[PDB]
Amino acid sequence: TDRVSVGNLRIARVLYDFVNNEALPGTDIDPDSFWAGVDKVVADLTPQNQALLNARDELQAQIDKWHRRRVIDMDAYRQFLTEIGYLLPEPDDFTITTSGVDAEITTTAGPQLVVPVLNARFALNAANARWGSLYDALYGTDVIPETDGAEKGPTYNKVRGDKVIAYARKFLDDSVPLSSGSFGDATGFTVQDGQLVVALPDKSTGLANPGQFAGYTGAAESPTSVLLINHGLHIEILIDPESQVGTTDRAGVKDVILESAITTIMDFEDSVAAVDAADKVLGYRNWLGLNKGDLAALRVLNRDRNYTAPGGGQFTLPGRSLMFVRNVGHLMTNDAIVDTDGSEVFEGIMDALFTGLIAIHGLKASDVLINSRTGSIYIVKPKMHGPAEVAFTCELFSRVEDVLGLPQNTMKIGIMDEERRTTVNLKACIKAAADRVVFINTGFLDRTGDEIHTSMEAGPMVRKGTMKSQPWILAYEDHNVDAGLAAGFSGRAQVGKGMWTMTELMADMVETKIAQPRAGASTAWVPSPTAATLHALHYHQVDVAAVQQGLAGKRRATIEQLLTIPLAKELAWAPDEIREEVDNNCQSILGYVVRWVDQGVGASKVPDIHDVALMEDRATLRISSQLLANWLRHGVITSADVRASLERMAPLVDRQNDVAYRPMAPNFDDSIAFLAAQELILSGAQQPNGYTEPILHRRRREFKARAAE
Ligand SMILES: Cc1ccccc1C(=O)CC(=O)C(=O)O
Numbered sequence: 001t002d003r004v005s006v007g008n009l010r011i012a013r014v015l016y017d018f019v020n021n022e023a024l025p026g027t028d029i030d031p032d033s034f035w036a037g038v039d040k041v042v043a044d045l046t047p048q049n050q051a052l053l054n055a056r057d058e059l060q061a062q063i064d065k066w067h068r069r070r071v072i073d074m075d076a077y078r079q080f081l082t083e084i085g086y087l088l089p090e091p092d093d094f095t096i097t098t099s100g101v102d103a104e105i106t107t108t109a110g111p112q113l114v115v116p117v118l119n120a121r122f123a124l125n126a127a128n129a130r131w132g133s134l135y136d137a138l139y140g141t142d143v144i145p146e147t148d149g150a151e152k153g154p155t156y157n158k159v160r161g162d163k164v165i166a167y168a169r170k171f172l173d174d175s176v177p178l179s180s181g182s183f184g185d186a187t188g189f190t191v192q193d194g195q196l197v198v199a200l201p202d203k204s205t206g207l208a209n210p211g212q213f214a215g216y217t218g219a220a221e222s223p224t225s226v227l228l229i230n231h232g233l234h235i236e237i238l239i240d241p242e243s244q245v246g247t248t249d250r251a252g253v254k255d256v257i258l259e260s261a262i263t264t265i266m267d268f269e270d271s272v273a274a275v276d277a278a279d280k281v282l283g284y285r286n287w288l289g290l291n292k293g294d295l296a297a298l299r300v301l302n303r304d305r306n307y308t309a310p311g312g313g314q315f316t317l318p319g320r321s322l323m324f325v326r327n328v329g330h331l332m333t334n335d336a337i338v339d340t341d342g343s344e345v346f347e348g349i350m351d352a353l354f355t356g357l358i359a360i361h362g363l364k365a366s367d368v369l370i371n372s373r374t375g376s377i378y379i380v381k382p383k384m385h386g387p388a389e390v391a392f393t394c395e396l397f398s399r400v401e402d403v404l405g406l407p408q409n410t411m412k413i414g415i416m417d418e419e420r421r422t423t424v425n426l427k428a429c430i431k432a433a434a435d436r437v438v439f440i441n442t443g444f445l446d447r448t449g450d451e452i453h454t455s456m457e458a459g460p461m462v463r464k465g466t467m468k469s470q471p472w473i474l475a476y477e478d479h480n481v482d483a484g485l486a487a488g489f490s491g492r493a494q495v496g497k498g499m500w501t502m503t504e505l506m507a508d509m510v511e512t513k514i515a516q517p518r519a520g521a522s523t524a525w526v527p528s529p530t531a532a533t534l535h536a537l538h539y540h541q542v543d544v545a546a547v548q549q550g551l552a553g554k555r556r557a558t559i560e561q562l563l564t565i566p567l568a569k570e571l572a573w574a575p576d577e578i579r580e581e582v583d584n585n586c587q588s589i590l591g592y593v594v595r596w597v598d599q600g601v602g603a604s605k606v607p608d609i610h611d612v613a614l615m616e617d618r619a620t621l622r623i624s625s626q627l628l629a630n631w632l633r634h635g636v637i638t639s640a641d642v643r644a645s646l647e648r649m650a651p652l653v654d655r656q657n658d659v660a661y662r663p664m665a666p667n668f669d670d671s672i673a674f675l676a677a678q679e680l681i682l683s684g685a686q687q688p689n690g691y692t693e694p695i696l697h698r699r700r701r702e703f704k705a706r707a708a709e
């Protein structure tokens with residue numbers, strides 16, 4: 001075989017070599033000790049990992065049976081969940097004690113970017129998205145409407161560009177207002193006695209709050225740029241009258257640069273497809289290159305930014321997004337390592353070991369600098385159900401730290417609140433990680449998937465779009481904020497909210513996503529560097545720190561509200577509405593899955609039934625498949641409806657896609673990808689907690705097997 005024996009484990013050769021030859025050198029960790037620790041940790045923790053998974057199944061069985069035996073008593077339901085151990089006692093008030101955390105996390109409110117780690121180009125751009133051009137983000141998106149005269153063309157449109165300039169001028173007025181007048185009338189900027197002076201047509205003025213002046217570049221009397229700060233976030237006005245845009249500007253302003261993606265989550269979970277050692281190694285290698293600073297795709301990582309202080313001295317700001325890594329959760333095994341019985345090893349355990357080992361490089365000098373200067377490794381742990389599962393993650397990290405010779409608590413945990421049993425036990429979950437937690441985040445897409453599967457037997461659910469605004473989800477959002485603030489997260493840890501999936505609807509995002517920081521979230525998720533820059537605007541308009549202060553002590557969600565099942569009312573839909581829902585889900589499912597199975601792409605932009613481009617990953621797939629499963633289970637639709645829609649949408653997806661692409665139609669059953677999509681719906685009710693990995697992984701491996709022979 002092509003495996004390496006270490007104790008009871010048989011490690012795929014490609015993974016063994018990668019760890020030894022690429023990851024271990026420079027960590028000062030004895031290799032034999034590392035591998036012994038791998039075997040030991042896997043041996044010691046696997047039983048509890050299995051027990052926790054079995055507990056999920058047992059609880060779901062009882063809940064399924066509860067709905068089945070009744071013909072909607074919140075009182076009785078709540079007592080039942082208590083009896084079975086689903087709803088646990090709430091612990092007394094406490095405050096988290098997490099330490100050694102960077103300011104980007106404890107203090108700074110701003111955008112958080114998530115990107116698939118298996119795509120080096122995207123990962124690189126994402127790390128570099130700490131700073132982004134506001135002009136490019138406005139000009140290149142629909143935030144400036146493409147009305148007549150302002151449409152995008154092959155070359156620069158001054159009507160459009162002038163609207164960009166004015167938009168940003170208004171942003172400056174709103175964010176760092178002048179003592180008198182408006183940035184729109186500025187004719188120049190200078191630094192005099194350490195104070196920013198803005199020349200206006202018939203006078204000059206300073207800032208209403210001179211403390212917002214953070215620095216400059218070039219000569220004080222004719223700067224190349226001016227640096228401002230507001231709500232802890234930097235804004236840089238680039239000055240160059242000799243530039244394409246600058247020459248058209250009254251003050252020669254070239255661009256406005258926003259500090260944007262303050263942190264970035266490098267994702268090994270829902271936005272990547274990795275089903276064997278080869279895929280995991282591609283991912284691990286990228287994570288390694290990021291932490292060593294030498295990833296090159298040839299584009300590379302940016303250096304820090306140099307500035308002159310108001311007084312005349314020097315300082316630097318970080319050029320890169322502070323990096324988290326999202327490990328997989330407790331569910332899946334992977335055959336990258338198997339034991340002597342041929343049993344696959346739990347992937348979550350493997351990720352802790354390997355991504356933790358690799359992260360050590362980010363704690364030390366890059367030959368090309370330092371991810372975490374405070375000495376922490378930031379791991380987002382997804383898809384946990386309840387406080388015991390959180391405690392298990394903490395014990396896993398404790399054991400890994402021992403293997404890696406790291407101080408206890410080095411490996412921090414970003415807790416996704418994205419499963420119902422975590423939501424309804426959130427305080428206890430936070431308490432279980434009280435010395436490790438660096439965020440809680442409402443992963444609302446997974447949470448919706450879990451909502452549907454948990455009450456699968458209850459009755460038919462409301463349509464997917466409707467889910468987005470159901471009582472249960474709004475309560476879940478407020479409850480998360482309440483719990484975090486009560487645990488003392490303000491100034492200590494991030495309170496985060498979810499992803500904006502409509503990658504091209506930036507005007508809509510700028511209009512609507514402002515609700516997130518208004519709700520007291522100190523970060524929320526964006527799909528791209530461009531969206532990070534635009535979402536940053538919201539943090540300039542809302543003072544999140546103040547909002548969190550104002551929410552202190554408030555309790556705005558009850559357990560009854562959290563437990564309100566999103567069942568549909570009688571006669572809710574006309575036939576065309578049902579057909580729309582089916583087609584919409586089938587389109588999104590097929591569009592995502594075909595690239596997953598045939599190309600190993602874990603995140604794709606897929607137009608919905610309204611031609612809206614949506615960023616799809618396993619969470620959104622979890623919702624679509626579970627919703628159709630639910631409708632099939634309750635007779636809203638038939639298996640022929642599902643068949644018809646999948647077959648209808650298949651050619652449109654073939655059309656949307658080429659090169660490595662293999663069309664699904666007309667020979668649907670020759671397409672493993674098409675059969676995968678079908679399986680996800682038809683077997684959806686039987687998947688543990690409605691998770692999509694078991695099917696996707698089986699089918700992707702099947703496809704590789706055929707393409708290989
Ligand atoms: C990264 C991403 C990109 C696009 C869509 C979703 C996602 C998520 O992975 C979201 C998430 O965890 C949650 O809501 O469950």
Ligand SMILES: [Mg+2]
Nearest residue numbers: 061064065686
């Ligand atoms: Mg059953």
Ligand SMILES: [Mg+2]
Nearest residue numbers: 418443446619
């Ligand atoms: Mg999720």
Ligand SMILES: [Mg+2]
Nearest residue numbers: 230231542543
């Ligand atoms: Mg303010």
